[PDB]
Design a protein around this ligand. Sequence first.
Ligand SMILES: *[C@@H]1O[C@H](CO)[C@@H](O[C@@H]2O[C@H](CO)[C@@H](O[C@@H]3O[C@H](CO[C@H]4O[C@H](CO)[C@@H](O)[C@H](O)[C@@H]4O)[C@@H](O)[C@H](O[C@H]4O[C@H](CO)[C@@H](O)[C@H](O)[C@@H]4O)[C@@H]3O)[C@H](O)[C@H]2NC(C)=O)[C@H](O)[C@H]1NC(C)=O
Ligand SMILES: *[C@@H]1O[C@H](CO)[C@@H](O[C@@H]2O[C@H](CO)[C@@H](O[C@@H]3O[C@H](CO[C@H]4O[C@H](CO)[C@@H](O)[C@H](O)[C@@H]4O)[C@@H](O)[C@H](O[C@H]4O[C@H](CO)[C@@H](O)[C@H](O)[C@@H]4O)[C@@H]3O)[C@H](O)[C@H]2NC(C)=O)[C@H](O)[C@H]1NC(C)=O
Ligand SMILES: *[C@@H]1O[C@H](CO)[C@@H](O[C@@H]2O[C@H](CO)[C@@H](O[C@@H]3O[C@H](CO)[C@@H](O)[C@H](O[C@H]4O[C@H](CO)[C@@H](O)[C@H](O)[C@@H]4O)[C@@H]3O)[C@H](O)[C@H]2NC(C)=O)[C@H](O)[C@H]1NC(C)=O
Ligand SMILES: *[C@@H]1O[C@H](CO)[C@@H](O[C@@H]2O[C@H](CO)[C@@H](O)[C@H](O)[C@H]2NC(C)=O)[C@H](O)[C@H]1NC(C)=O
Ligand SMILES: [Cl-]
Ligand SMILES: [Cl-]
Ligand code: NA
Ligand SMILES: [Zn+2]
Ligand SMILES: [Zn+2]
Ligand SMILES: [Zn+2]
Ligand SMILES: [Zn+2]
Ligand SMILES: [Zn+2]
Ligand SMILES: [Zn+2]
Lengths: 266, 251
Amino acid sequence: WSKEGHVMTCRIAQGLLNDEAAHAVKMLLPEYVNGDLSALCVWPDQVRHWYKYKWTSPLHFIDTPDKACNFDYERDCHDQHGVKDMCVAGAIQNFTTQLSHYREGTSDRRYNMTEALLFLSHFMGDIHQPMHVGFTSDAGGNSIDLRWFRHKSNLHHVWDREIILTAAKDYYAKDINLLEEDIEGDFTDGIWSDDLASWRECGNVFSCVNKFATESINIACKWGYKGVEAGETLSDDYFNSRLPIVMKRVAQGGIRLAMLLNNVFG
Amino acid sequence: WSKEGHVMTCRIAQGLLNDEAAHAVKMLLPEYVNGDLSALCVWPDQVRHWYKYKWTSPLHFIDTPDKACNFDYERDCHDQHGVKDMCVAGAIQNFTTQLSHYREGTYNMTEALLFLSHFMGDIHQPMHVGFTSDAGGNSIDLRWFRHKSNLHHVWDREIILTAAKDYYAKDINLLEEDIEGDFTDGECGNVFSCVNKFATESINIACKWGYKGVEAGETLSDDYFNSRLPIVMKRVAQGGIRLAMLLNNVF
Ligand SMILES: *[C@@H]1O[C@H](CO)[C@@H](O[C@@H]2O[C@H](CO)[C@@H](O[C@@H]3O[C@H](CO[C@H]4O[C@H](CO)[C@@H](O)[C@H](O)[C@@H]4O)[C@@H](O)[C@H](O[C@H]4O[C@H](CO)[C@@H](O)[C@H](O)[C@@H]4O)[C@@H]3O)[C@H](O)[C@H]2NC(C)=O)[C@H](O)[C@H]1NC(C)=O
Ligand SMILES: *[C@@H]1O[C@H](CO)[C@@H](O[C@@H]2O[C@H](CO)[C@@H](O[C@@H]3O[C@H](CO[C@H]4O[C@H](CO)[C@@H](O)[C@H](O)[C@@H]4O)[C@@H](O)[C@H](O[C@H]4O[C@H](CO)[C@@H](O)[C@H](O)[C@@H]4O)[C@@H]3O)[C@H](O)[C@H]2NC(C)=O)[C@H](O)[C@H]1NC(C)=O
Ligand SMILES: *[C@@H]1O[C@H](CO)[C@@H](O[C@@H]2O[C@H](CO)[C@@H](O[C@@H]3O[C@H](CO)[C@@H](O)[C@H](O[C@H]4O[C@H](CO)[C@@H](O)[C@H](O)[C@@H]4O)[C@@H]3O)[C@H](O)[C@H]2NC(C)=O)[C@H](O)[C@H]1NC(C)=O
Ligand SMILES: *[C@@H]1O[C@H](CO)[C@@H](O[C@@H]2O[C@H](CO)[C@@H](O)[C@H](O)[C@H]2NC(C)=O)[C@H](O)[C@H]1NC(C)=O
Ligand SMILES: [Cl-]
Ligand SMILES: [Cl-]
Ligand code: NA
Ligand SMILES: [Zn+2]
Ligand SMILES: [Zn+2]
Ligand SMILES: [Zn+2]
Ligand SMILES: [Zn+2]
Ligand SMILES: [Zn+2]
Ligand SMILES: [Zn+2]
């Protein structure tokens, strides 16, 4: 996601933390964000360019083969040079494990738990963004130039940001907090209120990340790539049919991130 | 150490405490641990990740120059940016001094105790006083029997867990009681020289027994376990005896 998908994913998660998770997160954050996890959830997108963290660059996405329309861990979860686990599914296992050590203390210098938290948070959002688990050849739609309403864009960015911005502008006065509260409502009192247990119950971590990836690639083929040709214009119909899917994936990432943090600390 | 080495170090100390040091420790500890210091001496390993206590991070160890195979306080006792005393040797002195003010009433004393007890353990862990380029073995990746591990972790935990499961039905308490009995049945000038000695013992062991024979990517099993185990038990005992020493003098 661009900034807004991450901020929403993480504010939703933070307001659903249990007391032990809430506390750990508060202790792990710098004083300057005043307890707000969401103030830092886009941090990995900035630092992936830093030499020190260039190893984090393939952890943002999954490349699945063109047209295959499924996800297979062994086949897909590696960077370009075939190094194992270097995809957003592997990243989530990794940093979830690191955080499980914090609780007992039993770890050493190799791991920085503030970075473990921010990475896990970020990457739980990214795996929920369908176009982050899209095709290898178009790099999750980045190569597919197109027009979003009146301006130039690409299919990846339509999912990372344009759909979110158009919704914010059209219905919520450009105020992401209000879009976020609508998403809260839809899972507190609304259309998704009876699905939270099913969203939360995905087996062990390895099993959860396969399920999140699968959902993502599945949506990429059915809703992302589908109906979209390079150079064409996407407007009302595509927005109207896809906004609910974007909103849902923002919700699911928040709930599931809350779920991991609650299990790893509590 | 990981948790079990700290808990053992601290239980062995509390039972060697004179009446003044014991009463001190009871008054500084929170209601909820019911007088059990060991219940809280892994605390520094949690709080080192907290923003509020970032500065405690380098106090867990000492990085000595690769192959040098010796310790020197002015050469070594600093963080990665040169700030002096920011090493486990510096921290033990720091927190000794702080606790000297507890009786007089003349700094948070609960924290000083927990940091002291913890760090007296860590200085005794040989690999907390190892080389700088592999971070005290942390980046020497290997196998401990079947398990993916690293050399640093072999000493923090693997050797202790493996002796626990093998000889004590996984019960740390029985292993402790056997270290207590074996190394309690038969002093330095100041605290500065005390910590120098502890630190030098640990660097020596690291060279002779930690790093020696160990190849990256290789499996350590019965031979390395059998031979190093009694070195690990000694260090646990030494740590706990000497920590009782300091607490006894300061209180
Ligand atoms: C000198 O230094 C020490 C350590 O840095 C400080 O002591 C800490 O002080 C805080 C209070 O500010 C303590 O934190 C609190 O501990 C309570 C104790 O409960 C324990 O036992 C129950 C079961 O009986 C467990 O369930 C629980 O997890 C604890 O292990 C907690 O009940 C408190 O919880 C409340 O606050 C937190 C966060 O604010 C919320 O998440 C909770 O919902 C709840 O509202 C709290 O966690 C801490 O234990 C102390 N640590 C130690 C090592 O003693 C001293 O305060 C400091 N001295 C001075 C003068 O400032
Ligand atoms: C575990 O990992 C985390 C994350 O990697 C580390 O946390 C970072 O620690 C550094 C300290 O090295 C923090 O960097 C400093 O942050 C200060 C505050 O930044 C905020 O406010 C400023 C302006 O008011 C904004 O510009 C900024 O966006 C922030 O909102 C700054 O004051 C510092 O900047 C100045 O000093 C440095 C020199 O230290 C110069 O290089 C700079 O150019 C500048 O002049 C500085 O950047 C950083 O914010 C922390 N990040 C996070 C996410 O927490 C932990 O330290 C690490 N733990 C261990 C043990 O290593
Ligand atoms: C002895 O114990 C005492 C605690 O009782 C302990 O004092 C602490 O020392 C640290 C230094 O490591 C102090 O933290 C510093 O705060 C000042 C501002 O007042 C800053 O100058 C320092 O900035 C550094 O760290 C920044 C944050 O990451 C970096 O951005 C920057 O580059 C600097 O490197 C640093 O934050 C801490 O506040 C005191 N606390 C108290 C209560 O005095 C002391 O370190 C102990 N020493 C040993 C050897 O055990
Ligand atoms: C698990 O997290 C750690 C960071 O704590 C990563 O460790 C790095 O691994 C790469 C190998 O690709 C090395 O180049 C770096 O030097 C390592 N850094 C450290 C600090 O150990 C590791 O890549 C992570 N794995 C996954 C799948 O996320
Ligand atoms: Cl940073
Ligand atoms: Cl605490
Ligand atoms: Na030096
Ligand atoms: Zn993103
Ligand atoms: Zn993206
Ligand atoms: Zn990202
Ligand atoms: Zn330790
Ligand atoms: Zn260690
Ligand atoms: Zn430690």
